[PDB]
């Protein structure tokens, strides 16, 4: 797998966009919420304050939904879900779901090794 069709995946603003005063209070979570207040310095976009999501921070449509390895991660749950990826091997990467048991993970991993598909978590419930 050369996997080189994609070019130089860059990511403008790799930071998290935490909520304003999420570090001050425990009731306020770090999931982003737009400040709708009338005297909000974050809403009025002062200097030195946090930055909000805009559409300007969007990623390149050629390098969107790609991992740093260069594939799109696709969740599988069994070998019949592995068979939908067998002719798209250089562009997709299978990922076993979190609730697949340890007995079935060694079946899915063997089928993916026989098909050449790249599994992004082959060490889950490995024992």
């Amino acid at each position: 797998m050369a996997s080189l069709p994609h070019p130089k995946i860059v990511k403008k603003h790799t930071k998290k966009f935490k909520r304003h005063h999420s570090d001050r209070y425990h009731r306020v979570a770090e999931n982003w919420r737009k400040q709708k207040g009338i005297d909000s310095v974050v809403r009025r976009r002062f200097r030195g304050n946090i930055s909000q999501p805009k559409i300007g921070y969007g990623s390149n449509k050629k390098t969107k939904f790609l991992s740093p390895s260069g594939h799109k991660t696709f969740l599988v749950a069994n070998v019949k879900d592995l068979e939908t990826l067998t002719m798209h091997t250089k562009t997709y990467a299978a990922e076993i779901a979190h609730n697949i048991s340890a007995k079935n993970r060694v079946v899915i991993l063997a089928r993916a090794k026989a098909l050449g598909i790249k599994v992004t978590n082959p060490k889950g419930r490995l024992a």
């Binding site: 696709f74 599988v76 798209h88």
Partner: peptide, 15 residues
């Protein structure tokens, strides 16, 4: 079925 498939999977051989 933890993730259903794309509309028709545009194939991406090298050009």
């Amino acid at each position: 079925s933890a993730q259903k498939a794309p509309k028709w999977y545009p194939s991406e051989d090298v050009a």
